[PDB]
Amino acid sequence: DPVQRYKMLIPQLKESLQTLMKVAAQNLIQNTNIDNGQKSSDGPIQRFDKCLEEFYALCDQLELCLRLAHECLSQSCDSAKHSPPYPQYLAVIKAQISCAKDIHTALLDCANKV
């Protein structure tokens, strides 16, 4: 379900990335403080590595959805460019495969002939 899922992740991805940059700033401020002493923060930490990993994860899920979309789309399009009888369809399939293989093997033969 490519379109709805992509539209569902993109806002979620934006929210995750905004959280990510904010936690990056939070930990950097906290740590440069504690290095320069000068102060501390009693509040919780909001661990950062987790946030970066969650963002990478969401990026990965979107990658999956979108690759599946492109591959299934190209599959269906190439199926169109070579088709319009279920057993007859299987038959024309077997024929197609045979023809492709014969082309490939003739090319292999002339190449091996050197």
Partner: protein, 108 residues
């Protein structure tokens, strides 16, 4: 690998890029373009070089063996003579045909 082996190897590459034996996985036009470009350029270039070699040999043969080149000329000329009288004879047959046809249409 004097020169001809190079040409054979180049042709072998320019085709066998695709044929080889293995699973194909998407074909991502760009790499196909880059491969075909490089292979075909090397092929045409080794063709360049073999032509250069043969022509150089002909120049040498000219500056050394002129009996050879003059005999080449006599051969080509006589071949053209044969081709010429063949053409004119064919046309003469055609003229005879159409001559009879026209004067017949006149007689009728």
């Amino acid at each position: 690998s004097t020169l001809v082996d190079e040409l054979e190897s180049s042709f072998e590459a320019c085709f066998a890029s695709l044929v080889s034996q293995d699973y194909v996985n998407g074909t991502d036009q760009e790499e196909i373009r880059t491969g075909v470009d490089q292979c075909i350029q090397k092929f045409l270039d080794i063709a360049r070089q073999t032509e250069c070699f043969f022509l150089q040999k002909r120049l040498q043969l000219s500056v050394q063996k002129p009996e050879q080149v003059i005999k080449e000329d006599v051969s080509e000329l006589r071949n053209e003579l044969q081709r010429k009288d063949a053409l004119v004879q064919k046309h003469l047959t055609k003229l005879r045909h159409w001559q009879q046809v026209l004067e017949d249409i006149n007689v009728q």
